[PDB]
């Protein structure tokens, strides 16, 4: 199978995932209207980010739209959680949009708990970009995608070994990170439910791209 991912070394993979990183967008000037507008613009960058993720392009088109349809809210959330790490108790949706929980609130608290966990774990940026690529490829549902996931796994381990963590600490930290992905899947599913009810209530207009990704959950 033609693939750039399986050709890359561990450090080349990290370097590629770092260079593929999307930018931190700003909010414009209700609250959910701002977040909707923000998430919509972030989705445009995510799509092109995914195309820069090693292995994603080598997948068929229909597999590409499928993973994005499944993971888009997971990817938005882990990005939000990452940005909010240095702001414990608050969520940094944008540099000009720092929010507390009392300004959907149950989901806000879950994001705060995730941000606090990442922060006390001292999650690194190189580990973070690995987690996002894992989320993207594990959202659908040896297979090619499973081979890539195995390699990103080797990448996480490789990063931890360079950090100076023992073999025991690597397996434990790897487990800690991947278990958080389960909670990220939870937040995404819950957010998806509320966003569709939000569509039915006609109170804030979901964008074209957002309406589309929503209809996919199906």
């Amino acid at each position: 199978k033609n693939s750039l991912a399986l050709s890359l070394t561990a450090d080349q993979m990290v370097s590629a995932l770092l260079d593929a990183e999307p930018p931190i967008l700003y909010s414009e000037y209700s609250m959910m209207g701002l977040l909707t507008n923000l998430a919509d613009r972030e989705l445009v960058h995510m799509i092109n980010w995914a195309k820069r993720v090693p292995g994603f392009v080598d997948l068929t088109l229909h597999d590409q739209v499928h993973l994005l349809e499944c993971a888009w809210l997971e990817i938005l959330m882990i990005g939000l959680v990452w940005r909010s790490m240095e702001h414990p108790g608050k969520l940094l949706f944008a540099p000009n949009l720092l929010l507390d929980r009392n300004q959907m609130v149950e989901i806000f608290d879950m994001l705060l708990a995730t941000s606090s966990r990442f922060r006390m774990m001292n999650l690194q940026g190189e580990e973070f970009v690995c987690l996002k690529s894992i989320i993207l490829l594990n959202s659908g549902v040896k297979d090619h995608i499973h081979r890539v996931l195995d390699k990103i796994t080797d990448t996480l381990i490789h990063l931890m070994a360079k950090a100076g963590l023992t073999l025991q600490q690597q397996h434990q930290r790897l487990a800690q990170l991947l278990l958080i992905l389960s909670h990220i899947r939870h937040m995404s599913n819950k957010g998806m439910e509320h966003l569709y009810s939000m569509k039915c209530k006609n109170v804030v207009p979901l964008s074209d791209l957002l309406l589309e990704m929503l209809d996919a959950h199906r």
Binding site: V44, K51, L61, V65, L68, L209
Partner: peptide, 9 residues
Amino acid sequence: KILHRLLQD
């Protein structure tokens, strides 16, 4: 769909 328009272009 917008997805496979941005995904191609």
